[PDB]
Amino acid sequence: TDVNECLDPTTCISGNCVNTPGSYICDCPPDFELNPTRVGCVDTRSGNCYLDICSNEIGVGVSKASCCCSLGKAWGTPCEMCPAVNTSEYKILCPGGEGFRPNPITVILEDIDECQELPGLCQGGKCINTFGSFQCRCPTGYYLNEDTRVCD
Ligand SMILES: [Sm+3]
Ligand SMILES: [Sm+3]
Ligand SMILES: [Sm+3]
């Protein structure tokens, strides 16, 4: 008889498993698509990332997870609000919690590089990417405005 692999927790990352004879299928939620190896779901669309809500663009042409699993509050056009951190939506979009996103091809979790993807988080300063976060240093004479993310 068949193994019901859906009882395995590593099965169908960010997706809904449906057991079949042989292995199983992963049903991806709306806006998500199955990766090449069929072990999980990822949102592969591109869109702008916004700090407020759609305004205050901090990233251009980035994925929704890179935006929303970081400091973004809204993403894309038409504007989609990032899911709140305690919802099932956030669990699906950010399976590794804050600061990380699944590789669009291997679905392996990787650190989001905020300096490469969301430069607007440090307007006018020097950004250093870190594991799970990033650092922003404003040049001498300027200070980080926490609400706008602009050195001054
Ligand atoms: Sm099976
Ligand atoms: Sm829902
Ligand atoms: Sm990072």
Curated annotation (Swiss-Prot):
Residues annotated as glycosylated: 23, 86, 133
Superkingdom classification of source: Eukaryota
Subcellular location: Secreted
Cysteine pairs bridged by disulfides in the record: 6-17, 12-26, 28-41, 49-67, 54-79, 68-82, 69-94, 115-127, 122-136, 138-151
Domain TB positions: 47-94
All copies of domain EGF-like, residue ranges: 2-42, 111-152
Modified how: Cleavage of N- and C-terminus by furin is required for incorporation into the extracellular matrix and assembly into microfibrils. The C-terminus, which corresponds to the Asprosin chain, was initially thought to constitute a propeptide. Fibrillin-1 and Asprosin chains are still linked together during the secretion from cells, but are subsequently separated by furin, an essential step for incorporation of Fibrillin-1 into the nascent microfibrils.
Disease: Marfan syndrome: A hereditary disorder of connective tissue that affects the skeletal, ocular, and cardiovascular systems. A wide variety of skeletal abnormalities occurs with Marfan syndrome, including scoliosis, chest wall deformity, tall stature, abnormal joint mobility. Ectopia lentis occurs in most of the patients and is almost always bilateral. The leading cause of premature death is progressive dilation of the aortic root and ascending aorta, causing aortic incompetence and dissection.
Family of this protein: Belongs to the fibrillin family.
Descriptive protein name: Fibrillin-1
Native source species: Homo sapiens
Parent-record interval covered: 1486 to 1647 of 2871
